Amino acid sequence: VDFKLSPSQLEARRHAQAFANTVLTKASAEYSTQKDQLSRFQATRPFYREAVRHGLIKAQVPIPLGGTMESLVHESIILEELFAVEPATSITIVATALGLMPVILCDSPSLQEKFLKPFISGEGEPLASLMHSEPNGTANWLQKGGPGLQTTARKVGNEWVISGEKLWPSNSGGWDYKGADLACVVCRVSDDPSKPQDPNVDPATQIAVLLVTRETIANNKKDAYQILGEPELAGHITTSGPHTRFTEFHVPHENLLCTPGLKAQGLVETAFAMSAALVGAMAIGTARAAFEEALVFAKSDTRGGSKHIIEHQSVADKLIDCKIRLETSRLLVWKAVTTLEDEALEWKVKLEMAMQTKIYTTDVAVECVIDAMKAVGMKSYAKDMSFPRLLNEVMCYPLFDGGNIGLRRRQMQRVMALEDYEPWAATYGS
Amino acid sequence: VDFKLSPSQLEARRHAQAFANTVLTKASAEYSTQKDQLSRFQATRPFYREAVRHGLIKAQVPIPLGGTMESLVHESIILEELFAVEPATSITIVATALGLMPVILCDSPSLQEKFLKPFISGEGEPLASLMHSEPNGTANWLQKGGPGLQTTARKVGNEWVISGEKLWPSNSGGWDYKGADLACVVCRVSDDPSKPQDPNVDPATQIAVLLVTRETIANNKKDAYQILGEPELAGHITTSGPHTRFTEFHVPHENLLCTPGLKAQGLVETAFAMSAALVGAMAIGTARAAFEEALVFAKSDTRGGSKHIIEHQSVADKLIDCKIRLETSRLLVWKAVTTLEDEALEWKVKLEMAMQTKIYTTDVAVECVIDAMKAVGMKSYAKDMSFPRLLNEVMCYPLFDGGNIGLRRRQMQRVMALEDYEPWAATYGS
Amino acid sequence: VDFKLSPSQLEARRHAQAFANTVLTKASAEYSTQKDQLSRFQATRPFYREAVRHGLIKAQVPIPLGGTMESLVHESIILEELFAVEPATSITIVATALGLMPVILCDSPSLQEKFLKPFISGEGEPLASLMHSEPNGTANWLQKGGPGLQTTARKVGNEWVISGEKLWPSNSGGWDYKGADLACVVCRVSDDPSKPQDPNVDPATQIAVLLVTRETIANNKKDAYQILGEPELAGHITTSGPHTRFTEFHVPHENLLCTPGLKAQGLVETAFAMSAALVGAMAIGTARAAFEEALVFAKSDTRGGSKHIIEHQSVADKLIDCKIRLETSRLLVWKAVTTLEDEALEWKVKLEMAMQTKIYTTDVAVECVIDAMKAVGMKSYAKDMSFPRLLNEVMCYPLFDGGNIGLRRRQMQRVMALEDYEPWAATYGS
Amino acid sequence: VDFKLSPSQLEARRHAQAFANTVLTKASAEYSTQKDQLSRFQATRPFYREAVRHGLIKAQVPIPLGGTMESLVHESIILEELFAVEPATSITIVATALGLMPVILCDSPSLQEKFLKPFISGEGEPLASLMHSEPNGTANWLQKGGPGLQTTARKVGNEWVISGEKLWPSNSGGWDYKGADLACVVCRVSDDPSKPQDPNVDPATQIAVLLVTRETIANNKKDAYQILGEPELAGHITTSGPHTRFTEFHVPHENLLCTPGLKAQGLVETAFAMSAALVGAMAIGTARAAFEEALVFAKSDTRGGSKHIIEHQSVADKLIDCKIRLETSRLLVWKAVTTLEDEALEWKVKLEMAMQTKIYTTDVAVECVIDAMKAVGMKSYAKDMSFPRLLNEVMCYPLFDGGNIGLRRRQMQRVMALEDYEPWAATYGS
Ligand SMILES: Cc1cc2nc3c(=O)[nH]c(=O)nc-3n(C[C@H](O)[C@H](O)[C@H](O)COP(=O)(O)OP(=O)(O)OC[C@H]3O[C@@H](n4cnc5c(N)ncnc54)[C@H](O)[C@@H]3O)c2cc1C
Ligand SMILES: Cc1cc2nc3c(=O)[nH]c(=O)nc-3n(C[C@H](O)[C@H](O)[C@H](O)COP(=O)(O)OP(=O)(O)OC[C@H]3O[C@@H](n4cnc5c(N)ncnc54)[C@H](O)[C@@H]3O)c2cc1C
Ligand SMILES: Cc1cc2nc3c(=O)[nH]c(=O)nc-3n(C[C@H](O)[C@H](O)[C@H](O)COP(=O)(O)OP(=O)(O)OC[C@H]3O[C@@H](n4cnc5c(N)ncnc54)[C@H](O)[C@@H]3O)c2cc1C
Ligand SMILES: Cc1cc2nc3c(=O)[nH]c(=O)nc-3n(C[C@H](O)[C@H](O)[C@H](O)COP(=O)(O)OP(=O)(O)OC[C@H]3O[C@@H](n4cnc5c(N)ncnc54)[C@H](O)[C@@H]3O)c2cc1C
């Protein structure tokens, strides 16, 4: 076992850091004063443009597919550096990565060449979105006997017809509400959308992914694709993840990502398992920003006393707890993404490790930001410090990318209950 | 022993609830459109006006002093109901209460009659502020051999001259920055403010409290009293707690609250111990709003599954944990205020109980809000629910009113380290 | 609302302290030499004798039934003092009180007069046991479609015949394995014990409680009642709670406690709700002993340094956290038992409060003992301090008297999920 | 960056597992029948003899020094597997590794060759001990102005004379109270032991380490070396760590480990920093045994319900938290030991990483055992399961090898407060 970073991993860090410090630090003056989420997202477009120019979207796509992604550990180091400075734009890049993952993972090389083209060009501001989440919730989307996804699709001729609503998926409506450049829309196949999901058939066997582009939306009637709203978020105030309604929305058969059923559900689960692992890097960045701000403050401020506050044991204890949470978190992320890259390990081992990672890093990042605030004291509550923004941003992580309580813990639980469960297969082999 | 509420405690609660729902619910539509903190505080003036007409400012003063305060348990009940709905204006009421407290507690009936007069009238919108906190911190203000308070006072003729800065004290500038109707300014006596505090004298013997009114301010040169800034807060966005600088600010000797030294420190300690106990009620109201909103959601929503999510054990575990935190918090607050009202008990015992109460309720209220958010899941993160506001608001409580890490834990540690410490004296007697 | 203790409550405390210090402190010299659990329990008989002589068993029976119980708050005070010194014998008293409860609370005065008689006499060493728990578990005993209790009973002529096994019920075999003086055996009614519980039935409608005395056991064949074993416990090493098998055990119909079904389940639920509330006083006593030992150590020992260890913030922080856990725990126990006593409150309100109390106090007692050990440090790990015993004893509390995870949380969850659940009914009526 | 185990790491694991399962499982049948700590420890001798025969003591010594230690990752894997089964004898091996470390670390090949010889022979049952800890404590041994170590040494011609007492050091009295085969006795140099440590000299400049063998002890008068007692421990009930008194105890100058002062303090600090990282693997072993026992239980028992208990969300939540604690702990240990072996890294970077590791792994192991017990429920409390032993054993870890509260957190705080502290130097370099 080895924890040393290669020259390309150190360069990936230096590059990410330089981009964050020279480009992302300027985003706040653009977005900070806009009234609504969409406006804030739009104000972020020149920074995404720069990220594309710096190669950061091309770096979300594997080299075999014409991108420049070197590894998932490189990706982890990049995301930690970006999120330690500014989640604006950084969040857009990862949302796009998620949006691309089903195509990156699928088994059609002609689909990959066609739909990944804009994202490896190094030009423009192309957005992708994995459109899974819904107004009524998704924690129970695979539950045999329940209503399932309320976004359904039916084959009519040589096309599919989507009806229903999505809520929350990042970048889904694009910069201007005429659509992401690529959206992977996750649907439940229902030949008749009025009738409930058949409780005698496993929900996983009825999943289909349909690829929707700006062209697709332009080819439909205006009322077939409507953005009904844009949630105002506590933190990550510059992301877009709207309420979208498809009404009789036609999509050509060639845009069907794969065979409906277990293969499609598989692509989705895989994409979301990879995000589960990497989301820990974002939480680390946010929490690391809080720790470092509190640390510098505790090593330079006496708070009207005779020594720097880090010399009070209760202050150092908080800082120690923060530092520990960050160190364990990062190791767990690097373990997770490395596990995901291991061809030897069966999927359930990868999936359990990804779930653990998401659950731990996100929950623990919140504690880290709060302890940092408690250590700095009253000054952390004013907006001339970063903590108000970090507090709001950090609370997103346990909730999003599949919340810990409803999705990730239950995905991990299902794995642990299986008869052939091997708790240590990722470490000690099978 | 008994927890039944008297008819007048029940009436205080009905009155508080009616006030909250007829008046305080309208505040948000007024303060929400104001871009800066002072303006938000100013938009809140008509609601404080209504608070005064409803008798709520008069109820912060004991009956023997012309007020209508029935008891601290009545107060605890009122504060919980107000803060469960809207901390805007509610926070102003309690900040005024704290400003009044050094006067309420002092042994001079002439000062009490004079300076409490506007607060017991039922007219206007009179504000009071206890001005203790400073830019450089206050956790170490009584540390022997340290710099001490940087707001100092010196006697010159038949007046005192205040030099230095305060930061954070609620209401201290009034509605218009010409001053609170009553400010208790806490100073360190120093004949020559350019000289450090003398390291061989106990800081507590150099504390003075000087009463500064609007008239005091108007009797000084314009540049003798100035507001340098108004912090933009993460939550409690409608409160004012400015950065104030006194420069050669003259106060009559008749305005000195009491003899400088241990008597003055003692009045500040007592005031802040009473607030330590009652700040729990504010934390309970906020956390209670989060718990109730999560409870109703959990009972009303299936999240696309086969049953309401309260029926999931992980969801119920969060709700159970919130409920336990709230229940234990309320009990401890009522214990602490009843203990403060007990004439048979020594100060050290009351102080220890008040510290415990502040530490427990405020730390635990934060966990209550966060767990509530986790239970609700993603929808908790959007501002169509109340959680974004509650999370920002709840994080104030561990930090303010004497932070838990630097001030309240240290005060309690000091009492616990005394040779005659009796842990259980508030319960089982001495 | 009032927390002040009456003269009789203070006397109850004094009496309980004097008993624990002059009698219970001598127990260890006797049980300590005994190599198995039963023999340790037997070694404890002379101390239970003394407890009876001091009126402590009589104090577990209400005055209208010939006992001397003053109130549940008196009971809480007695238990805290007892368990602060020595859980040996204390645990027998409390287990007997649980065994008496179904008879104390039943609607048959003839059963009360006959079966409580030995317990109000003030003589001998009479034991009672509520025999509910089983080798296969009881967390799911009321699960519809589940196997239910494996101890069943059937009516044959003018008798009931019991088949199956119990495990864990305190005192159940008596001093000599010829039986407790009174055992309430909870059975599921089944005319054929080889047949699985009907999945269509509500399991609570099948419950019967049969009273079994030493004369009942003697009236049966010797192999109809056998003790198969006695668990060797991590702590509470002097308690007995054996593995008992009933094989065609005949009981007179006049020993049926009440109408089978909902009424019988209700008596058991009520007895265990009462124990849920009071078990916190035992947790508090154990945790309090750990806190006070650490506190005395922290204020007298420098650990080879220049100052008492309580002077170190990290140490003081552990002690503060223990103190707060103990203070909140006692308040919650007093609230719970006062709630149970309230004639005007509905059952589910009482039950919910009792569940909260059990969950909180027992979880938090464990943390209190462990934090106290960390504060004292390495010396806490050797048996010349009490912490090794306290750690083993405290870990009983979250697991016993209905475990928190499987029973108490799920009882509380069920009440919260009821359409008419009112969270603050025990405090703010309505 | 890589977590993959080499073939030799996998072989170390297999070999350690086979030794634990074939040899160590048999230990309990021998030590459980003995009446006190010493006897239990003595009953452990044949198992240590087997460990020596299987090369496990030789594997504590680096290959350059004639041992077989392959790497600290190898050692971590071995310790996790040993402590997962049986800490008896396992504890003796690690205590011997600690005892050897000051010699392994020193810069004197002639000392190394002489004193390490029995330990690399593969013969007998040689024991080492690092005798640091004392009756009065050691958390403040380096405190300037404090009393310091109460075990002192004075130079008398060509010999040193030791006065004072040790308490706790494992193996220090050997199998028979005639001494460990090698003890490294840490002393404070003092010409006159009746005089207090000079408050004007930095305690670390007065540290000496004297090597004491069985020959040294036999060459002194009988009353010069006395075992006064053997603590009865809550867990690890088969280790020896006696109370030793040196009275005018003569040691040859050629047995001095190095020049007294910073160099000697540095060997002690380094040895204890290496143990701090590795003790994590012991904590993991114990917690892993709890987790796996709870997991097997939860996957095979319904607890009288219809489904395996792991299907209940609150049970799964506990197992998930245990699993996460174990995964993060192991990563942190492997990171910490790999950091210690990195010659490019400054000592303070290694030290910080080792303290973090000790703090985290030992605190969290306790939580893991307790969670596992709560998940299993009542049955976990009886000695037919492993948990009573594991609970007592896991509580050792945060207290021993320098407790977290008094020692490790203070050592880490000291590093963090340094002006040139680089928090991430172990991951991203300097
Ligand atoms: C900034 C941001 C970016 C996002 N990016 C995307 C994106 O790119 N694509 C996309 O599709 N979505 C995205 N989301 C949404 C998010 O990934 C999912 O909606 C969310 O994580 C799922 O919500 P939830 O887990 O709370 O599930 P919900 O279904 O909303 O359930 C909510 C709560 O109900 C409870 N619950 C429900 N069922 C159970 C159960 N069976 N067991 C136990 N508890 C249960 C749990 O407490 C759960 O937390 C984004 C959201 C945000 C804020
Ligand atoms: C909405 C609001 C209302 C307020 N109302 C008032 C008011 O009416 N009047 C008023 O005067 N102020 C008021 N305040 C200010 C507040 O009461 C105090 O400034 C704040 O509670 C004290 O800050 P602190 O406890 O963080 O101490 P600081 O001195 O700022 O110390 C900050 C941190 O340093 C550490 N620290 C410092 N010294 C030590 C030590 N010796 N040991 C351990 N740790 C230490 C702790 O981590 C502490 O949290 C208000 C503030 C707000 C936001
Ligand atoms: C000293 C002592 C005295 C005792 N006194 C008595 C007495 O007087 N009378 C008596 O009858 N018993 C007595 N007991 C036994 C004890 O009250 C119960 O057996 C125990 O509290 C119930 O066990 P449990 O709660 O762990 O349930 P179990 O049925 O053993 O369940 C074990 C675990 O399975 C899980 N589980 C099972 N079902 C669910 C579910 N539906 N949801 C979630 N999790 C689940 C939980 O993690 C639970 O902890 C005593 C025991 C001791 C040690
Ligand atoms: C099985 C076992 C094996 C052991 N092996 C060895 C061995 O091989 N060699 C050896 O020498 N010892 C050994 N020990 C002993 C152990 O390493 C040390 O004595 C112990 O870890 C140090 O004790 P402590 O950390 O509790 O410090 P203590 O000095 O005993 O301090 C006790 C407590 O006081 C408080 N405290 C003291 N000073 C401060 C401070 N400055 N700041 C904050 N809090 C403070 C802390 O709460 C601390 O926990 C062993 C013990 C056991 C049980």
Diameter of chain D measured on Cα atoms: 80
Residues paired with residue C2 on neighbouring β-strands, in sequence order: B2
Q: Which amino acid is at A235?
A: G
Q: Which amino acid is at B265?
A: Q
Diameter of chain C measured on Cα atoms: 80
- Whole-number Å distance between alpha carbons of B178 and B215: 9
Ligand nearest to the CA of C183: 3
- Whole-number Å distance between alpha carbons of B100 and B129: 7
Q: C211 C-alpha vs ligand 1 centroid, how far in Å?
A: 53
Q: What are phi and psi of B129, to 5 degrees?
A: -145, 135
- Whole-number Å distance between alpha carbons of C360 and C404: 9
Q: Atom 27 in ligand 3: which residue has the minimum CA distance?
A: C139
DSSP state of C304: S
- Whole-number Å distance between alpha carbons of B423 and B420: 10
Distances (CA, A) of A34 to A46, A389, B382, D10, D99: 15, 15, 17, 58, 65
For residue D334, list chain A residues with Cβ-Cβ distance below 8 A. Answer: 1
Residues of D with CB under 8 A from a CB of B: 312-314, 317
- Whole-number Å distance between alpha carbons of D26 and D10: 24
Angle at C369 between CA C363 and CA C371, to 5 degrees: 100
Residues of chain A by 3-state class (helix, strand, coil), percent to 5 = 55, 10, 35
For residue A317, list chain C residues with Cβ-Cβ distance below 8 A. Answer: 313-314, 317
For residue C405, list chain D residues with Cβ-Cβ distance below 8 A. Answer: 314-315, 318, 374-375, 377
Q: Which helix (H) or strand (E) holds A185?
A: strand A182-189
Using DSSP's 3-state secondary structure scheme, residue A208 falls into strand
Q: A268 C-alpha vs ligand 3 centroid, how far in Å?
A: 41
Pick from A328, A356, A419: CB nearest D360? A328
- Whole-number Å distance between alpha carbons of C153 and A18: 78
Which residue's entry shows tokens 């401020």? Answer: A301
CB A89 within 8 A of CB A130: no
Number of alpha carbons in the 13 Å side-chain half-sphere of residue B285:
26
Q: Which residues of D are annotated as a binding site for FAD?
A: 130-133, 138-140, 168-170, 303, 312-313, 374-378, 399-403
Helix axes D313-340, A409-417, angle to 10 degrees: 90
- Whole-number Å distance between alpha carbons of C168 and C95: 11
Report H helices in A192-233: 214-218
Q: Which atom of ligand 4 is nearest to the CA of C318?
A: 47
Q: What one-character-per-residue DSSP string does C310-332 give? A: GGSHHHHHHHHHHHHHHHHHHHH
- Chain CA centroid to CA C117, Å: 21
Instruction: Tell me the Ramachandran region of residue D286: left when phi exceeds 0, alpha when psi lies from -120 to 50, beta otherwise.
Output: alpha
Residue A298 Cβ inside 6 Å of ligand 2? The answer reads no
Which residue's entry shows tokens 């089978």? Answer: C260
CB D140 within 8 A of CB C302: yes
Residue of D nearest to C404 (CA): D374
Residues of chain C by 3-state class (helix, strand, coil), percent to 5 = 55, 10, 35
C405, C408, C410, C411: residue to mutate for ligand 3 pocket, most atoms within 8 A of CB? C405
Q: Which atom of ligand 4 is nearest to the CA of D239?
A: 1
Closest Cα partner for D316 from C337, B277, B313?
A: B313
Pick from B3, B308, B409: CB nearest C335? B3
Residues paired with residue C226 on neighbouring β-strands, in sequence order: C245
Closest Cα partner for D340 from D350, D327, D348?
A: D350
- Whole-number Å distance between alpha carbons of A392 and A364: 14
Hey, how many other C-beta atoms are within 10 angstroms of the C-beta on B36?
Answer: 11
Buried b (16+ CB within 10 A) or exposed e, D359-386: bbbbbbbbbbbbbbbbbbbbbbbbeebb
- Whole-number Å distance between alpha carbons of A371 and B388: 19
Non-local (6+) Cβ contacts of B307 within 8 A are none
Q: For residue B373, give both structure tokens.
A: 């958010």
Q: A96 C-alpha vs ligand 3 centroid, how far in Å?
A: 50
- Whole-number Å distance between alpha carbons of C416 and A109: 53
Which residue's entry shows tokens 């609150």? Answer: D314
CB B152 within 8 A of CB B230: no
- Whole-number Å distance between alpha carbons of A198 and A147: 9
- Whole-number Å distance between alpha carbons of C311 and B414: 8
Length of chain C: 430
Q: A133 C-alpha vs ligand 1 centroid, how far in Å?
A: 7
Non-local (6+) Cβ contacts of A252 within 8 A are A158, A159, A160, A216
Non-local (6+) Cβ contacts of C365 within 8 A are C283, C284, C286, C287, C325, C329, C394, C397
Q: Is residue C420 a known part of a binding site?
A: no
Strands C182-189 and C128-131: parallel
- Whole-number Å distance between alpha carbons of B329 and B317: 18
Distances (CA, A) of D129 to A235, A316, C347, C371: 55, 32, 62, 29
Q: Which amino acid is at D79?
A: L
Residues of chain D by 3-state class (helix, strand, coil), percent to 5 = 55, 10, 35
Q: For residue C293, give both structure tokens.
A: 């030992």
Closest Cα partner for B413 from C298, A320, D410?
A: C298
CB B153 within 8 A of CB B122: no
Q: For residue B141, give both structure tokens.
A: 């203000």
Using DSSP's 3-state secondary structure scheme, residue D245 falls into strand
Non-local (6+) Cβ contacts of B111 within 8 A are B103, B211, B257
Q: What one-character-per-residue DSSP string does A35-76 give? A: SSHHHHHHHTHHHHHHHHHTTTTGGGSBGGGTS-B--HHHHH
Q: What are phi and psi of C382, to 5 degrees?
A: -100, 150
Q: Atom 6 in ligand 4: which residue has the minimum CA distance?
A: D169
Closest Cα partner for A348 from A424, A277, A421, A279?
A: A421
* Integer-rounded Cα radius of gyration of chain D: 22
- Whole-number Å distance between alpha carbons of D276 and D268: 12
Q: Is residue B272 a known part of a binding site?
A: no
Hey, how many other C-beta atoms are within 10 angstroms of the C-beta on C77?
Answer: 28
Hey, how many other C-beta atoms are within 10 angstroms of the C-beta on C208?
Answer: 26
Buried b (16+ CB within 10 A) or exposed e, A135-166: bbbbbbbbbeebbbbbbbbbeeeebbbbbbbb
Mark yes or no for CB contact A356/D330 under 8 Å: no
Among B309, B311, B314, the residue to mutate for chain D (most D Cβ within 10 A): B314
Mark yes or no for CB contact A423/D291 under 8 Å: yes
Ligand nearest to the CA of C237: 3
- Chain CA centroid to CA B325, Å: 21
- Whole-number Å distance between alpha carbons of A105 and A112: 9
Q: For residue C409, give both structure tokens.
A: 């949380």
Strand ranges in A191-320 using DSSP code E only, listed in sequence order = 207-212, 225-229, 243-252
Using DSSP's 3-state secondary structure scheme, residue B219 falls into coil
Ligand nearest to the CA of A238: 1
Q: A80 C-alpha vs ligand 1 centroid, how far in Å?
A: 23
Distances (CA, A) of A111 to A102, B374, C270: 11, 38, 66
- Chain CA centroid to CA D128, Å: 12
- Whole-number Å distance between alpha carbons of A208 and B313: 31
Mark yes or no for CB contact C312/A312 under 8 Å: no
CB A26 within 8 A of CB A47: yes
* Integer-rounded Cα radius of gyration of chain A: 22
Using DSSP's 3-state secondary structure scheme, residue B228 falls into strand
Angle at A335 between CA D290 and CA A139, to 5 degrees: 75
Pick from A1, A295, A299: CB nearest D338? A1
For residue B328, list chain C residues with Cβ-Cβ distance below 8 A. Answer: 328, 331-332, 360
Q: B404 C-alpha vs ligand 2 centroid, how far in Å?
A: 8
Q: Is residue B376 a known part of a binding site?
A: yes
Residues paired with residue A183 on neighbouring β-strands, in sequence order: A129, A212
- Whole-number Å distance between alpha carbons of B134 and B147: 12
Q: What one-character-per-residue DSSP string does D188-225 give? A: EE-S-TTSPPPTTS-GGGGEEEEEE-HHHHHTS-GGGE
- Whole-number Å distance between alpha carbons of D368 and D376: 12
Q: What one-character-per-residue DSSP string does C375-390 give? A: HH-GGGGBTTSSHHHH
- Whole-number Å distance between alpha carbons of B147 and B144: 8
Q: D322 C-alpha vs ligand 4 centroid, how far in Å?
A: 26
- Whole-number Å distance between alpha carbons of C318 and C374: 8
For residue B316, list chain C residues with Cβ-Cβ distance below 8 A. Answer: 409, 412-413, 416-417
Residue D402 Cβ inside 6 Å of ligand 4? The answer reads yes
Mark yes or no for CB contact B316/C416 under 8 Å: yes
- Whole-number Å distance between alpha carbons of D81 and D78: 5
Among D307, D312, D314, D319, the residue to mutate for chain B (most B Cβ within 10 A): D314
Query: Which residue precedes each gap in chain A (C to N above 2.5 Å)?
Result: none
The resolution, in angstroms to one decimal, equals 2.1
Using DSSP's 3-state secondary structure scheme, residue D227 falls into strand
Among D293, D320, D358, D414, the residue to mutate for chain A (most A Cβ within 10 A): D320
Distances (CA, A) of C414 to A29, D177, D356: 51, 61, 42
Distances (CA, A) of C370 to A1, C388, C427: 35, 10, 33
Q: For residue B370, give both structure tokens.
A: 């966060």
Non-local (6+) Cβ contacts of B317 within 8 A are C409, D313, D314, D317
The CA distance from C323 to the nearest CA of chain B, in Å, is: 8
Length of chain D: 430
- Whole-number Å distance between alpha carbons of B199 and B117: 40
Report H helices in C105-237: 109-115, 214-218
Diameter of chain B measured on Cα atoms: 80
- Whole-number Å distance between alpha carbons of C298 and C316: 9
DSSP state of B196: P
Closest Cα partner for B188 from B223, B144, B127?
A: B144
For residue D312, list chain A residues with Cβ-Cβ distance below 8 A. Answer: none
Closest Cα partner for A297 from A226, A377, A356?
A: A377
Mark yes or no for CB contact A306/B139 under 8 Å: no
Instruction: Tell me the Ramachandran region of residue C243: left when phi exceeds 0, alpha when psi lies from -120 to 50, beta otherwise.
Output: beta
Contacting subunits of C (3+ beta carbon pairs below 8 A)? A, B, D
Count Cβ atoms within 10 A of the Cβ of residue C246 and give its class: 0-12 exposed, 13-18 middle, 19 or more buried: buried
CB B407 within 8 A of CB B415: no
Q: What are phi and psi of D169, to 5 degrees?
A: -65, 125
Q: Which helix (H) or strand (E) holds D360?
A: helix D347-376
Q: What are phi and psi of A212, to 5 degrees?
A: -125, 130
Count Cβ atoms within 10 A of the Cβ of residue D428 and give its class: 0-12 exposed, 13-18 middle, 19 or more buried: middle
- Chain CA centroid to CA A385, Å: 26
Contacting subunits of B (3+ beta carbon pairs below 8 A)? A, C, D
Which residue's entry shows tokens 């001494």? Answer: D179
Using DSSP's 3-state secondary structure scheme, residue D267 falls into helix
Q: For residue B225, give both structure tokens.
A: 């009293």
Residues paired with residue C69 on neighbouring β-strands, in sequence order: C62
Residue of B nearest to A401 (CA): B378
- Whole-number Å distance between alpha carbons of B285 and A346: 49
Pick from D328, D416, D426: CB nearest A328? D328
Q: Which domains does chain C have, with CATH numbers?
A: 1-127 (1.10.540.10), 128-261 (2.40.110.10), 262-430 (1.20.140.10)
Closest Cα partner for D352 from D399, D420, D262, D286?
A: D420
Q: Which amino acid is at A323?
A: K
Q: Give pairs for C321-325: CB < 8 Å, separation 24+.
A: C321/C367, C321/C368, C321/C371, C322/C287, C322/C290, C322/C291, C322/C294, C322/C368, C322/C371, C322/C372, C323/B356, C323/B416, C323/B423, C323/C291, C324/B356, C324/B359, C324/B360, C325/C287, C325/C364, C325/C365, C325/C367, C325/C368
Residue D356 Cβ inside 6 Å of ligand 4? The answer reads no
* Integer-rounded Cα radius of gyration of chain C: 22
Mark yes or no for CB contact B138/A404 under 8 Å: no
Ligand nearest to the CA of C310: 4
CB B69 within 8 A of CB B63: yes
CB C401 within 8 A of CB C276: yes
- Whole-number Å distance between alpha carbons of D65 and D72: 15
